[PDB]
Design a protein around this ligand. Structure first.
Ligand SMILES: O=P(O)(O)OC[C@H](O)CO
Ligand SMILES: O=P(O)(O)OC[C@H](O)CO
Ligand code: NA
Lengths: 121, 121
């Protein structure tokens, strides 16, 4: 659920999910159109393709359990869904960190309007 | 406070906080249930999600000051609360303007039974 995903992002990046990522670029803060603006934006994209491959699950709402082992995110075992969702969230969060040095305020509150077209996942 | 938030709204969109954004979709207002129906509806979902990260404050009434600098909304300095509450509002009002394009009357006075899923933040 967004609760785990959000506090996962703050642990990895130091930024709070909401203002930092709720509306970054074309895919961060749920969008679905356009050509990803940068690296951070590419992660929201990939994260969306990840959620999209869980038809049998409720990604935005199901609460899953996870712990940090020696500073690394580890998805605890739960249902098939909770596990796949958690991995999607972990991958996105970790990516966010890896690309912090390219995070541009220039893309926060980016006009969804400017994003046109549907990219294949 | 809502008196400042309503002012930004009228400035950025030209519409009155009340009708235009008080009974629109599943989130613009007080009901708060289901899945956002469109760009504008998401702008308001993200907004009381923002108000949820401020437990130690009271957004409805504490008054803050803001101004424009080269036409941009800037939150004047004050207490930590006033500043954070204002950032929530600032972003929301800008979000409403960036989406004046898809704002449709078909979402006004939207019925409760049409607000689906379980969503938390
Ligand atoms: O948890 P958020 O609101 O910061 O969202 C990020 C997007 O869902 C990534 O696709
Ligand atoms: O008309 P308002 O000022 O209550 O606007 C939108 C929603 O309340 C935001 O949560
Ligand atoms: Na669960």
């Amino acid at each position: 659920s967004l609760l785990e995903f959000g506090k996962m992002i703050l642990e990895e990046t130091g930024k709070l999910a909401i203002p930092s990522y709720s509306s970054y670029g074309c895919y961060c803060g749920w969008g679905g159109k356009g050509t990803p603006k940068d690296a951070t934006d590419r992660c929201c994209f990939v994260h969306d393709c990840c959620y999209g491959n869980l038809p049998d699950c409720n990604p935005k709402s199901d609460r899953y359990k996870y712990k940090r082992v020696n500073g690394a995110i580890v998805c605890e075992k739960g249902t098939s869904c909770e596990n796949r969702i958690c991995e999607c969230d972990k991958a996105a969060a970790i990516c966010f960190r890896q690309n912090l040095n390219t995070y541009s305020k220039k893309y926060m509150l980016y006009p969804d309007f400017l994003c046109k077209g549907e990219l294949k996942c």
